[PDB]
Give the backbone structure.
Amino acid sequence: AESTLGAAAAQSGRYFGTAIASGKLGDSAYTTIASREFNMVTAENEMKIDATEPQRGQFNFSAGDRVYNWAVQNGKQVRGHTLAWHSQQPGWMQSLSGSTLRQAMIDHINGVMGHYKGKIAQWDVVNEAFSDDGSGGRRDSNLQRTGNDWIEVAFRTARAADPAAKLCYNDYNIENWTWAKTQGVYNMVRDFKQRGVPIDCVGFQSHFNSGSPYNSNFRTTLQNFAALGVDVAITELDIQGASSSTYAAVTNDCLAVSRCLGITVWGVRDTDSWRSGDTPLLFNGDGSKKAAYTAVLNALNGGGQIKGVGSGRCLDVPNASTTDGTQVQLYDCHSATNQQWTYTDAGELRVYGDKCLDAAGTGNGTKVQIYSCWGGDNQKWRLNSDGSIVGVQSGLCLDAVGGGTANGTLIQLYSCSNGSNQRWTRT
Amino acid sequence: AESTLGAAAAQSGRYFGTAIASGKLGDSAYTTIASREFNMVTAENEMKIDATEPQRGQFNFSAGDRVYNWAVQNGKQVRGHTLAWHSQQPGWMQSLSGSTLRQAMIDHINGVMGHYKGKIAQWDVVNEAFSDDGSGGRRDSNLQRTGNDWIEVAFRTARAADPAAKLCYNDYNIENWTWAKTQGVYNMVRDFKQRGVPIDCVGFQSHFNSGSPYNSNFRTTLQNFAALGVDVAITELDIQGASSSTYAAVTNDCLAVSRCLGITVWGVRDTDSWRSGDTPLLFNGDGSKKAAYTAVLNALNGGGQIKGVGSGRCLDVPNASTTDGTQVQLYDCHSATNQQWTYTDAGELRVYGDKCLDAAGTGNGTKVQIYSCWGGDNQKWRLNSDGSIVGVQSGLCLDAVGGGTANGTLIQLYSCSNGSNQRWTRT
């Protein structure tokens, strides 16, 4: 299979998951996409400490089980998130220290894992234990202050509670190999492997933005960790701006590492994201696939001028005009600027540097023209592997009117038919 | 002055207004911008028929007066909108037809204008009476069914009610000269002027988008109507995507016609717009001046490499790198792509075609780098006439750290001080 992300990932033995919020399981548009596209699920909040043990010793699995059941019934495995973490602790746990806290941690781990024994593929045993100050050391938390060996204890406890689940250490800002935090984490897992501490995987959240951008050396980080004898996983992927190139690069990095189990994006639609303002995911608010979705899919499946297949002619802006509202047409191909289109990471087809292929509506017959680039979804396209060009906002295909092939044939939007007047090739 | 829209327009004897919503007058962020930037006001809904005469013969001016009082308290003139229209009619009026409706129309005009007698600069007496079917004829509505002379009667009635107000006919899609609607309106005004019907102005709503884009022949349209002996005004301006060139183009068209009274944008912030999804205004949701704001201000005031003045060097991307997160610096100018920056209508400073000058924060000391273009406000800049470059999101200026001037000097965001290390010239 290769029409969906999960299925395209399965082809190489990997998975493609998302974060699920039980609160949205009632939204039909939400579940339609989630059940179809992903084969791995992480509870966004339902399995955290404050959600599974509101009161000391009083476990509540209502929300967690709702997500677990939905996942399994729809063909997805589940990543447990998370058991030991300095953030979002219940009120009572915050008011604890010393061996008392160390004990509560142990009880919590046994309680949660006992309930889900043998049902969870991976567990984020310890989450975000290192500092961002730039030192590469543990962060100061009530857990760290109970003994530097608390992480080791958490893992030994987890292994005993459920030896079937892969135990991971999860963290952010550890993707760039040159960062001190990355080195801190590396040395810990290195130590752990030598002393026989039970750790099976390292999760790289992969929250990329201009403050902590993706760097190609991410592949090196993954390879270096995998070389220690642990599996690696991209656990909470999201990219500010959702650049198609960056999304593809990250996917290829995982595919290039045999120990990379799979990729999980942190949410379904941009509007579901904890950082919706960054439009960092693969589907937009309308539930429609973004340009990045197509880039990731092609990457999973595959390991200038725009010429129409049926006509042999090129997408042309009449008389090299630059006025907004000028409808594009088919014309004999030639090295002119009014025939050179650039496909940007945002998903636009630009000509003249700042003019965008634009759809003036969403129904059949909508004329395709050029207009000032501003970022509307009616100016974003998906270049499918089958040669079709689909408008993100309309979901319609670029179509050479009436199947015409002569110079001057106009371009419009029309329901995709796989016709030759809807197939294009880049030269 | 020349630092605000209103003040700049006054330098050519014109005004620059906005539409005000009484419900938002309690929002200090809203009013701060509104009172400072505009010297003309239109009530967005408060003076419509249903708002001023909820029951036949029972006039209510509480909503309209809140807008009016605010305007005059803050030194603004007011445009009345609107007296006769097929849309937004009170239920009781929608039930009328024939002579009964005709008289109700007359009564409504006398009541509203009597209340605001001598206090209103312009009144949109009749609004949107022509059709969009391409015939260039009258729109079918209960008012048009009372008789073709209903528009004339509305104007004669208004002139007698308040001789001090300029009486305008207002409509949309009459900006492009070639459209049948435009010419249908032209013929009506010509007819009125020949027969002595009192009409002083024609308002061009000018709501532009990719479905109905701005066209440079708009200037000839304005001249043609002005030639008839009526004033012209841009009454409800908004542009899908808020292109800087287009906003500047519309402004210059009005400045070229001696009889163009001024310009009114339909709203303050994009979020206040009836079409917020198209971000068609001059201020963003945060209340920050967009790239288009500066384009308009510069046009009102009469209005490649980026070389620093205090340094004499060019904005430079180190080693012609294309890696996201690369901090920009100063360096010996020279023709090289890594020093070629394109300023787009959206307000981005692009390099390498798809990389954007990006701010990784909003405070002083913030690192200015390059990152994949995606449309964030942190990738948008305003090029002031004083030579400074301000970040739309932070409101901070491009600053050469410590005032350095040698190669390798890093660029950051800092409070605008108009220092020589914050001034840049285009080359």
